[PDB]
Write a protein that binds this ligand. Structure first.
Ligand code: NAD
Ligand code: NAD
Ligand code: NAD
Ligand code: NAD
Lengths: 254, 254, 254, 254
């Protein structure tokens, strides 16, 4: 396949949450292949360091990895500030990190609910807070926040996850209004059922394969690279007047 | 005006969050006028006790008020269990309580963000957890969760509020799937700009009046009673096959 | 099983398209049970006459039936004017009629496309045109336009039908703005897969029964009366500040 | 100002309706700049011939223009077949043509309604019918159908136009399901208020300039080229698993 080049992304400073594995890793790789200067946080140290080495080996700018638990807001904001000290002000923020662990209403404790929101919802807000003054100094920027088809499909088996994934649309739309005067675009990206290693290992069974075939309009695997292309579009000059909106990349499910 | 009677609501046990003032108080009154046995929590003791006395004086079943800060999940769940001991299992849950205090991205602390979610998002989940076993014993039930046009309009000036208000759609839709086998309906109600005393006192100015007139299709005040009628419909047998959906009562704004 | 009474509907003048069978017949019955004065058009003469006699035998105001092919706009507008001569100005319009005949892209002729639009889309516009001056004289009114979950599902096998069913949202929303100054409300009602006799006999098989069970959150038949209750609500004073919006009655499918 | 290159578009055969002026002309230019072989229809002969000469003078493959009134389905389908004879099977279809003439409910005749639908709705269906067998032979393709924020805004003053613009979503979603097995993607593109020459000269006044400033989150003109970039993305291999969805390019209005 012959994929796009976005000359406007060369030299841009890009910060990604959860960039070590899964969709995050495809977004890190896609931006580095455009010549962007990427930084990302993850807790998966071995996979993250290997990804950075592989991208450099392929001829692209080595992404800057920092180990950071996104549940620790002070450590996360300190990490973003330290990376801004290395790369300069960020142009692009990608709020990708999540965790889709299943859970039942009747078993969720206060502590578990809090932890689900600390992983899936809170980091996005503090990431925006950490990058906006630099984006104003750079004359604008683009923020991409990840939702999920899970809440669109009324998906069962993880109601705190659906809650957090729907919340992304309110974060996007409130911020689009607040930040638009500074030429900062804020959009939602909503994947379908993406065949990452995690999805194949934990959640995909024969019944899940039959649900994909019934519900997708296009047959075949939705893959991390499909999502990465939409994020590159939304970060590039090509999308300069897109804001507040939801971009669904789902092979026709919802 | 000559408003509906819903014979199916007579004798039903109804729990409402934030029922002492504003839209909550109109929902308490509307259910009591149908002959339902209402219970509600609020922190506004004087207004809440006065509301209960006024409804009894008007000839209806006296609602049971309990003072409870919804930020304290253990106290809130204990309160629901104590009220179930008085009225029996609940048939209807209305997740109404919120707080729309304005705030700027750049000024939000970790503690403030946590408190916004503790008021606007977390109580709804634990309210559902507290009532579902009783609704199964009653052979079904109806859960009504409040969103807001704020996130639909990309409203500025309160991004944690828009985040929490969008999150309601994911709580509704994940739970509709999980609880539907038990004949428990779960729907979202989304008010427009409702002229409560709070809205008139804090947020309404000449510019806000001009925004209402430009954006509403129907001129005039959207009022608490308009929202109460939609909640009664969604709790009554008349709506027995509505679930997962959003009901917007907004005079045509969004 | 104890359904609502809407005192505001007693004596109201109600016009319904396609009121002789299916969901339309349930709407005609539901309005007559509230004491409204109903008129409706259909091509199904024997079923329509039988329904009017059954309603009269149940003790309600006998609906006025007129045979009319909605494809004939002049005849249809003349029929509405003649019924306005009998009942007075209409308060409520329900645009219900449709025909969901399946068809394949590659087989649709120009004449077939035009006929599909003549049945499914064009009548609604001219129904509104015919009732609006009377609604202005009555001091307002309520218009209910039927969509379908078909377009929300990306339903295959009838692309001109999905086209016409999505078009309802644009009719509703353009007219909500144009008619709101006259206190005329305009809303969309979107049924799920309603077990009318026609749906069961034309389109239902064992696979369809499995699709209903997988996709509905609430098990059991979505029935004409469920849709009728939503239309009563939207026509009654209880919904006086609902306009422009979509009300989905689908047991949680979409 | 350094816009993307999509190598997958070089040599692709692209058919555009209404490609002579406005957004259509920007789409024609953008595809030709990528090295695609473009054909388009319009009624604006002098503007269309000029555009083809300007594109040729810029060094790109010269688009093929044919004069055709899209209201004449047989003539339109014959024109597509003749252009397929010149370029080969089409890979990409862009259903862009429309006409937003204002009109009032009370003044619309049967003939005017039919003409509005003949211009704004019917051509898209027959364009798909004319290109699909070639797209199957090419092993897939991409269809882009234009909606409008007008229906999302509940825009007044043109109810047949809002009807036709909402109808696009049902055309897109029914066909995404029917054509997905052939690897044909079908998506909706929904512009905001795009500052074409026609919009500025017909519809813009000082009030409209204030409405744009209040409603857009990003200040400044939404331009034809912004829409063109979204259409390129949806036609390129980068969007190979996008189907059934709406892509809104509106500077944050709706
Ligand atoms: N994969 C899908 O099918 C799918 C579907 C819809 C939505 N999404 C969304 O796409 C985005 C990416 O999804 P994914 O499937 O790649 O997820 P994933 O769980 O596979 O990967 C998330 C990444 O974030 C990291 N991460 C998790 N918790 C962390 C923490 N506390 N601190 C730091 N890093 C942490 C993980 O280590 C991992 O590298 C998410 O927002 C997800 O909700 C994915
Ligand atoms: N009023 C509007 O214009 C509007 C618009 C859209 C959405 N809504 C939604 O409608 C619902 C009700 O809104 P409202 O305008 O009546 O709100 P409000 O702020 O006027 O009333 C909320 C009620 O909840 C109570 N409450 C707040 N914090 C509490 C806490 N910690 N513990 C216990 N009780 C607490 C308050 O005392 C009050 O009685 C909310 O979900 C709101 O987001 C309202
Ligand atoms: N039944 C469902 O599952 C379902 C699903 C979603 C949407 N809907 C919508 O609900 C509405 C009612 O659906 P239904 O299932 O009762 O439809 P139906 O086809 O069973 O009944 C439509 C009625 O309109 C009449 N009608 C059809 N063509 C006519 C014409 N040319 N002139 C006059 N009358 C004519 C029919 O005779 C019939 O009584 C429609 O708008 C439909 O699109 C229904
Ligand atoms: N411009 C906007 O603000 C805006 C807003 C939202 C949606 N849109 C949509 O974007 C698309 C393009 O809009 P636009 O503003 O460039 O429209 P436009 O009216 O300026 O241009 C449409 C083009 O189609 C051609 N056309 C019209 N009727 C024709 C016919 N009978 N036969 C052949 N060609 C015909 C015109 O000559 C013209 O070149 C449309 O689908 C429109 O509905 C535009």
């Amino acid at each position: 396949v012959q994929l796009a080049n976005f000359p406007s992304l060369k030299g841009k400073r890009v910060f990604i949450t959860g960039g070590g594995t899964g969709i995050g890793a495809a977004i890190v790789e896609a931006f580095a292949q455009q010549g962007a200067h990427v930084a990302f946080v993850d807790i998966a140290t071995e996979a993250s360091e290997a990804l950075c080495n592989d991208i450099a080996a392929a001829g692209h700018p080595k992404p800057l990895f920092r180990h950071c638990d996104l549940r620790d807001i002070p450590a996360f904001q300190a990490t973003i500030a330290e990376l801004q000290g290395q790369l300069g002000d960020f142009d692009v923020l990608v709020n990708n990190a999540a965790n889709d662990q299943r859970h039942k209403l009747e078993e969720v404790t206060l502590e578990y609910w809090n932890d689900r929101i600390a992983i899936n919802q809170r980091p996005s807000f503090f990431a925006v807070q950490s990058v906006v003054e630099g984006m104003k100094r750079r004359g604008g920027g683009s923020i991409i926040n990840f939702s999920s088809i899970s809440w669109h499909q009324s998906g069962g088996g993880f109601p705190v996850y659906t809650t957090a994934k729907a919340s992304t649309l309110g974060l996007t739309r409130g911020l689009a209004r607040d930040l638009g005067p500074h030429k900062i675009r804020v959009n939602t990206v909503t994947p379908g059922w993406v065949m990452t290693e995690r999805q194949i290992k934990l959640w995909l069974d024969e019944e899940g394969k039959k649900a994909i075939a019934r519900n997708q309009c296009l047959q075949g695997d939705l893959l991390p690279w499909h999502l990465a292309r939409m994020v590159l579009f939304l970060a590039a000059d090509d999308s300069a007047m897109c804001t507040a909106q939801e971009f669904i990349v789902d092979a026709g499910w919802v």
